[PDB]
């Protein structure tokens, strides 16, 4: 068969990329794959930044180095930085936060995008939260529009009280001035997120990498994420199937060898081979399902399951080579 | 001519089963709720107080540790208080929580309502969270319907994948059985909340008490809450304006005395009198605004601002006496 290369080398080749997002369900290796992509991009690119919106501090444990809320240069690299992210006006803002769930996340994302675009980097890798939170990250514009419409509805409906009280309170508690400031903050956030989305819908600058493992839940969340990215016009052409058991041998070669030499093995080795072969068959079924869903338009990169955790700078550097050009 | 400036209509309506107390933070929701409970303990055979306020303000109010389950109030025979704080099914539930924000609060409220309705009390007073969270509490049926529609949409879209994986996995990890179990849990929650909401729209059984203070923000949140209760068919006819400065005299007497003897007071007495007069003028303006918005259809109960915090059983008894039969 002729298919796209089973590696993430196309990410390194496309030198015009500015946003590289890495998504997937929790526990599939999002942080490790993101760190390896950052390590690989640090070679060709002048400046590379890694941004983690995962609530935990998995970036610090991954790089075996304390990573701050601001850019922290990665030990052993000259151009690789990391970053981990966790009164009338005030009352109206709290009413808006309570009425429209997700507006605070939208404003936090807007502030983060402004800070990152002002940090001036050539490429930013994005270790996102699990799929569920990334879907809200993608649905942010509808939340901003609902916030605008909620503010307008509140103004229209309570204009009588707002104007009658505007006469009373003085100084910096005018309900109309505070309401206009809330509208202006919503407008700032919406403009920032609109420019960011215009940059995101350009496959020249933005792409998405989906990480999964040969199990039902991971592939299901990967399909959810792919369909949502397709809906919102965000490009994705890389699926990383991690923790693959023995990505070199087939289930058939070793199954035949075992069927030919079954009675020659001790009880223990025979049980271990049988368990390993069964898990390999299940993983092969799920990899075939992946190749059915994708493969035509996606680079499917298979990564071997390792005994040790891929932590530390040197181990990550060695694993990135397995990521970008396999055996 | 106006309705009686007291909450005595709450005690008179013997058919009431749910008495909700809402308002902005710091206006005295907990104090008013505890006083209403103390007063209902006289006429009713058994009275329960339920606090959904995130903090543990009930314990500080009663000056006594109140548990997560009903704890009989010291010194009362019929007054109890209460303060309220891989896996395929879990993954689908998390997808629902991420897609529909507020479904977990809806299920928690359903469990709380089932527990309270099984505790069997004659009347339950409900110290709710600040206004925004009560407004979220009111939209629960729509949120449950949106959750149902999300589960059905996911079922329709991914039925092929779900059945194809059902063919594979064994035992109690069927994705289709898990989806049906999620639907059944949603149905349980929706039935409980439907019974509760049918009970809420009956003025025979449910009424709302709005607590506020003579300031703009409190009156604005009170108006929001009243309009939302009107939209959602929940009855409210009691506004409690708490922390009123000097509820006995009018704006004229002390102002006239001071303007006749202004230059005769020492610096300290003159400063305190001036601050008091300004506070009284502002409070009178906002109380007039309250009487403009309501009074025609609402019992407006004015409560005096006290130097001490209304903690302890005796202070609660005196504040309840000022609440149900004023001076």
Residue numbers in the entry:
A (entry chain B): 4 to 89, 105 to 345
B (entry chain A): 5 to 89, 104 to 345
What does the paper say about this structure?
A functionally diverse set of tail-anchored (TA) membrane proteins are delivered and inserted into the ER through a posttranslational pathway, termed the guided entry of TA protein (GET) system. In eukaryotes, ranging from microbes to animals, the GET system is mediated by a cytosolic ATPase (termed as TRC40 or ASNA-1 in humans and Get3 in fungi), which coordinates the translocation of TA proteins to the ER by binding with ER-bound receptors (WRB/CAML in mammals, Get1/2 in yeast and Arabidopsis). Furthermore, we solved the crystal structure of Pt-Get3a and determined that it does not contain the conserved CXXC motif, potentially leading to the spontaneous formation of a distinct parallelogram-shaped dimer in solution.
Moreover, we observed the apo-form crystal of Pt-Get3a at a resolution of 3.8 Å in the space group as I212121. However, both the structures were similar, with their RMSD ranging from 0.47 to 0.87 Å over all backbone Cα atoms. Moreover, Pt-Get3a existed as a distinct parallelogram-shaped dimer in the crystal, which markedly differed from the structures of classic U-shaped Get3 dimers. The parallelogram-shaped dimer might form due to the lack of the zinc-bound CXXC motif, which coordinates the open-to-closed transition of Get3 for TA protein targeting. Two parallelogram-shaped dimers (A/B and C/D) were assembled in a crystallographic tetramer aligned along the long axis of symmetry. Because of the lack of the conserved CXXC motif, monomers in a U-shaped Pt-Get3a dimer (A/D or B/C) are associated through two α-helical hairpins (α10 and N terminus of α11) from each monomer, which are located at the equivalent area of the CXXC motif in other Get3 crystal structures.
